[PDB]
Amino acid sequence: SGAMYIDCDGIKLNAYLDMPKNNPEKCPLCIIIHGFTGHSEERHIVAVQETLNEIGVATLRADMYGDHTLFKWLTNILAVVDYAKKLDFVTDIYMAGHSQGGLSVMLAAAMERDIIKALIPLSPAAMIPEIARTGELLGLKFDPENIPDELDAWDGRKLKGNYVRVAQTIRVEDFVDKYTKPVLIVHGDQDEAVPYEASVAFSKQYKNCKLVTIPGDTHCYDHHLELVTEAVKEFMLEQIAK
Amino acid sequence: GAMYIDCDGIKLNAYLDMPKNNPEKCPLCIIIHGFTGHSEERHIVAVQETLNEIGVATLRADMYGHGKSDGKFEDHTLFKWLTNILAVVDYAKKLDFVTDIYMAGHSQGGLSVMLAAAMERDIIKALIPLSPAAMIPEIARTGELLGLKFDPENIPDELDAWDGRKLKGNYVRVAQTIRVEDFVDKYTKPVLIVHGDQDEAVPYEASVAFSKQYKNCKLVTIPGDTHCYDHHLELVTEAVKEFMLEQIAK
Structure with a gap:
């Protein structure tokens, strides 16, 4: 349905709400949080968003900012959650994020552990x-x-x-320990920005995490974005089936 | 004077009070009130006045959703308060008259300054949590x-x-x-915790425990006294005074 903003503390957070094409009365929703340098319209985010819409999952792509800090970003992501909780079509709420957005949703999902049904950190920083x-x-x-x-x-x-x-x-590690619901971490094994091995380690610490490795690929999946979207599709079909 | 300190979309009400003599250089103590509290509360003003009397300027700041600041009480959190306090420290570091910066706070404000002092441990010379929550x-x-x-x-x-x-x-x-506990461990500069042993709101013994955790903390117990020092507010201001005279003496 399109561009929107969410008010938070006197600033506006830009977002997009995209429904599945059939315009369902009720459907799940995935919050998608891009990283610090990025934007919601970037290829690696749009591909994931389109993939989810295609399997019946609405998406809410959002900026985590309007002096940046993780306290501001987390505050803003709670505003986004609170907005999503009020949408009448929503059944379950899921969270995905890339890079510093990935770190942020790892943190926010623990804070929202009762609400967020599954978590998808994409090359989290x-x-x-x-x-x-x-x-x-x-x-x-x-x-x-x-x-x-x-x-x-x-x-x-x-x-x-x-x-x-x-x-x-x-x-x-405290926030990982507190989110025991399903997680999918995706990471390229030639990531020049964030070491792949970090995601290996965090995958072993989570109680219920699948790590999907994108062989040869970079931080923003320059070579095999389609392997990313396929993994996200398979995991999210599993989750919406529970 | 009173002034507003901008914190992105939120204006923070604050009071700057100078020592009587209007010195061209002096220390500055940031003072943070508690949950539902504000900068004009009796115990806050008593501490403020004491500091000004020994030559320390004070910056009392109303936090998000409190006092005369922006935001609704219901939407405040400790992350917002810590944001707010970083903003007030950033404002203070630009004041030409300031020498050293200190922090003090009551109850939720006492907690808040414990946390913010650690994050600002290079900048904050000593710390005074008053019955910290x-x-x-x-x-x-x-x-x-x-x-x-x-x-x-x-x-x-x-x-x-x-x-x-x-x-x-x-x-x-x-x-x-x-x-x-992480923040307590990080702030190794001088600390004065004050707490009434009949505090009905936040347990005295936690301050005993935190005082032992800190590298350099003195605990001043106010015998028989309440959360806001209904009986012996003077014992609190005397303790703040003696500790602060020790810090600022040159």
Whole structure:
């Protein structure tokens, strides 16, 4: 049905609501949260969105922001959840996200563990908190105890130190331990941005996680996006059948 | 003066009070009130006045959904409050007169400053949690918040209590994530915890425990006193005064 915005704390979160083509009275919905540098219309997100719509699952692609921090993003994602809970057509709510959106939905799904029926982290950037505690962020090295006011960051973006100050506090493993419902992690084994082996490890820690490895592929699935969508389709058909 | 500090879409009401003499350079203490509280409460103002009297400017800030700040009480959470406090610290770091920055807070504000001090441990020179509600996260994990009991795995949409207020269960979803002990471990600079041993609202013994966890914390017990120091508010301000004189003395 199209572009929309969700009000949160005096800012507006841009989103898109897409229904399955038959316009069902009642259907499940998947929240899809792109990453920090990305956008909802990007190929790797749209492909997943179209795939879900095709199997009868509505989608709500959303920005997790309108000084970015994981506290702001998580706050915004709770607003998106709260919006989705009010939609009359919705049966069950699912969550998917890519890269820093993947980390964010890993966190938010635990916070929403009673509501979110299954979780799909796509190449989640889930090591950020630990790396921030070592005093690294991309090519920068600082004393983890003396954080710079400004950090030159992802895709040229300038972040405040508050990003790190907040990130350092997040114990990802606590949120993994608390989400015991089904998870599908997808990750390319030639990912140059986020190490594949991180997803291996997080897959073993979750109680109920399937890891799907995209052989040869990059962070945004430049080579085999279709293997991503096939895995998501198979997993989500399994879940909507329960 | 009173002023608004912008925090993205949310204006935060704040009061800047200077020492009498209007010094060109002085320390600044950020002061954060508690849950349902605000910056003009008796105990808050008493601490503020004491600080100004020894030469410390103060910045009292009303948090999201409190006092004269934007937002609805029901939509506040500790993540919003910690966002708010980072905004107030960022504002303070731009004030030309400021030398060192300190933090103090009561109850939920005391918890909040424990957390924010750790995140700002390079910047915040000492920390004063006043009857800090430091057990909120652990107790939320067990299914209670300030006397209300619920299923911590099927959190209510809304909690209705506190003189006709409403609170979304998102407050609890957020609180449950917070590992207070991590933040205690990270802040190794001087700490003064004050707490009344007849506190009806938040248990005294948790402050005894946290005081022992901290690297450098002194615990001042107010004998017989209540959550907001109904009987011996002067003993609180004297303890703040002596501790702060020790920190600022040059």
